[PDB]
């Protein structure tokens with residue numbers, strides 16, 4: 001698949017290295033699940049995310 | 058931030074404030090437990106800088122605060138206040154003791170040079186800091202934030218008689234009333250990408266605040282992603 005087509009369905013980053021294959025990758029603190037496209041936190045607090053209730057309720 | 062809103066505690070975990078000759082004179086962002094990103098012009102030789110992470114009300118004690126001392130300053134090598142003080146306006150700060158990450162102290166995401174530039178193109182960014190809440194007025198006791206649309210490169214270059222280098226960019230409104238102001242520079246300009254925020258800029262300078270016709274100049278972080286990733290990498 002062209003890595004240019006909808007980012008290759010990769011949640012974050014997409015590429016094409018060896019046999020111009022659409023590889024996905026995440027950013028530090030995240031690891032790629034078996035869903036092979038989505039990223040999952042690999043640390044208690046990954047970057048760029050809010051983890052404090054925005055509501056008291 | 059003029060024309061902004063009060064942030065909820067823990068809404069921008071990566072945000073930090075800098076204290077020296079004056080309190081909250083500049084902002085910053087957490088790259089990781091030991092590194093902060095900020096503006097180069099915020100670091101005037103001599104002044105001892107103090108960094109507080111987990112900050113909300115700059116006046117009270119929320120118990121989420123974390124103070125740290127800077128044991129090193131690395132301004133971008135192309136930065137030269139003699140020639141110009143806003144060109145290559147980006148610097149790194151190494152903390153003495155590592156910050157303890159939690160819901161109030163979380164780093165910002167820095168993406169590839171290529172994506173950083175794509176996320177910037179999404180049009181909207183979030184800017185936050187404890188700077189002036191009115192052009193020439195008082196500062197904010199509580200962290201303020203504001204969403205700013207990206208401004209046309211042609212428009213940007215035509216708004217000032219000063220040279221806008223390709224290292225910087227414009228954001229803000231044509232109307233005015235809402236802008237970043239002094240005390241905010243060094244702070245983050247983030248873009249949210251499906252619930253995950255990435256640093257897309259650094260609040261640098263401007264001409265007055267929220268004045269119609271003029272915008273806020275931000276450092277195009279995409280041209281610096283690598284330098285950051287390099288000198289902040291942990292060992």
Ligand SMILES: NC(=[NH2+])c1ccc(N)cc1
Nearest residue numbers: 237238239262263265273
């Ligand atoms: N956006 C601005 N006008 C601005 C931002 C920072 C600053 N220090 C001065 C002016």
Ligand SMILES: [Ca+2]
Nearest residue numbers: 114117118119
């Ligand atoms: Ca406080």
